[PDB]
Design a binder for this molecule. Sequence first.
Ligand SMILES: Nc1ncnc2c1ncn2[C@@H]1O[C@H](COP(=O)(O)OP(=O)(O)O)[C@@H](O)[C@H]1O
Ligand SMILES: [Mg+2]
Length: 339
Amino acid sequence: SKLTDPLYIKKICLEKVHDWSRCNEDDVCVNQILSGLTNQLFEVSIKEDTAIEYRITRRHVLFRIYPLSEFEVYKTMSKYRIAPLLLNTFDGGRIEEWLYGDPLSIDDLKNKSILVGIANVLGKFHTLSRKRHLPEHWDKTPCVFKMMDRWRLAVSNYKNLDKVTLDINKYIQESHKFLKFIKIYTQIENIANDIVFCHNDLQENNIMNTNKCLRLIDFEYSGYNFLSADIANFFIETTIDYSYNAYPFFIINKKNYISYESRILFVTTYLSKYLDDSTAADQDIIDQFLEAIEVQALGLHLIWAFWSIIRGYQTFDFFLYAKERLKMYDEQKQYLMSK
Ligand SMILES: Nc1ncnc2c1ncn2[C@@H]1O[C@H](COP(=O)(O)OP(=O)(O)O)[C@@H](O)[C@H]1O
Ligand SMILES: [Mg+2]
């Protein structure tokens, strides 16, 4: 695999990237980068002296080897320059614009100026639905209903769930109680309940930063959802570090949950890009908005716990991670019911 993959990759890029066929396999550099289990990813480049030699302008590409089709969404996202530009396709993968920065770190999410930048970008991203014409066949049923329903059904079919938690049926029961609550709750006249085209996996590793220019990647879970669910996911992710490089390959720091003041600064910045100048906007917009986010956070914990259980059964400690997201459900629920 590791020794044989590069040669395959080199041949395709030579013929699928403009001007690269001027080179040979010896001028091209393949480097596998870290990814999820759903794809293999490689930084492919040309040797820099050879790029200057052969006057090659595009020095790097991303080589990607493989409800809503991820691909269909990705190509719409690329069209509007939200995602890295699609360069080309081959059977089994795609070649994308290479982004020069780095994913945001978990500690970046503490920086207020970065939070502001994320809120600006997310505020704009969320207007796409009303400002462009998205493919109309896309299901507009909020992904919270779909993900919760689909993934809970699948977890109910498993044997040995007590090997995840003694109290698993409590959370299977919690889920449809949440869906019924969320059916009523999101009918409140508040923009947090707007249904827009959502990323659905908003987190530091999906936000590329090039010299203070923030880009979004990874549209695998993308679809229409309550706008506050995209934001709740981001807020949650301030307490989860996936960079940790030994078992269980994630670290939870709940003390790091984005502070109240940072949350108001994020929501305010967000609304300054999401809302039109002429928006019909009440006094408690921020209060209700911050409340809807915490409400959605509750469901996300279930959604991602069930997701992680399915991955555990079909394959990072997925089960410990589910367990942790369930403890978060419990904690979040106490919090909500408090106020
Ligand atoms: N177009 C790109 N340019 C440079 N780096 C990328 C690009 N796309 C992804 N990466 C890197 O690979 C990682 C995973 O990419 P992504 O597709 O979002 O995740 P996954 O492969 O887990 O679905 C990112 O954190 C980023 O560092
Ligand atoms: Mg990702």
